[PDB]
Design an enzyme around this catalytic site. Structure first.
Site, mmCIF file in Angstrom:
data_model
loop_
_atom_site.group_PDB
_atom_site.id
_atom_site.type_symbol
_atom_site.label_atom_id
_atom_site.label_comp_id
_atom_site.label_asym_id
_atom_site.label_seq_id
_atom_site.Cartn_x
_atom_site.Cartn_y
_atom_site.Cartn_z
ATOM 1 N N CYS A 38 0.835 -1.192 0.000
ATOM 2 C CA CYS A 38 0.000 0.000 0.000
ATOM 3 C C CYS A 38 0.871 1.242 0.000
ATOM 4 O O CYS A 38 1.659 1.457 0.921
ATOM 5 C CB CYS A 38 -0.920 0.028 1.217
ATOM 6 S SG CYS A 38 -1.746 -1.549 1.558
ATOM 7 N N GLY A 39 0.736 2.043 -1.042
ATOM 8 C CA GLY A 39 1.501 3.264 -1.136
ATOM 9 C C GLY A 39 2.925 3.011 -1.577
ATOM 10 O O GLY A 39 3.203 2.922 -2.775
#
Length: 167
Positions: A38-39
């Protein structure tokens, strides 16, 4: 000795099926409290994957425990995984159950890890990406490398242990 080593606690696999962590005992290993895809990671996936494959010859395992965005205070990634969903990023190395690595909601094993080794920063709390703990052949956290440590940053502390941490 309430929890002598990491293996005094039990681990959940990527799907929270019982992960036999203690079969990694006798060998040194890293364990990343990581935002599971994530990210961005500050080079965690690469370092973790690399270290596993490179040092598997001396008997080394990298375990990456994803971070459960639903914990409430997941490191600094709590502002990140709000538009993302972290769930076992998967790799050439064992990725585990996402736990809330922080706060009160932390997996008891990470409550052990965190309390044991602050590492290289201020205090012993989990406030960032992957952050590997340098776990020796016995299951004792010798270091905590935040997402700021690269491959060789870990190697300087790892190589001696891969050889022999205690005996």
């Amino acid at each position: 000795g309430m929890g002598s080593s990491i293996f005094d606690f039990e681990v959940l696999d990527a799907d929270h099926k019982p992960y036999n962590l203690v079969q990694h005992k006798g060998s040194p290993l890293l364990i990343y409290n990581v935002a599971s895809k994530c990210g961005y990671t500050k080079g965690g996936y690469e370092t973790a994957t690399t270290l596993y494959n490179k040092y598997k010859s001396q008997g080394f395992t990298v375990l990456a425990f994803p971070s459960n965005q639903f914990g409430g205070q997941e490191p600094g990634n709590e502002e990140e995984i709000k538009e993302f969903v972290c769930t076992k990023f998967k790799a050439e190395f064992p990725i585990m159950a996402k736990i809330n690595v922080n706060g009160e909601n932390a997996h008891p094993l990470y409550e052990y890890m965190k309390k044991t080794k602050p590492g290289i920063l201020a205090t012993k709390a989990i406030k960032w990406n992957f952050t590997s703990f340098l776990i020796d052949r016995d299951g004792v956290p010798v270091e905590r490398f935040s997402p700021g440590a690269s491959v060789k940053d870990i190697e300087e502390k790892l190589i001696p242990l891969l050889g022999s941490a205690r005996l």
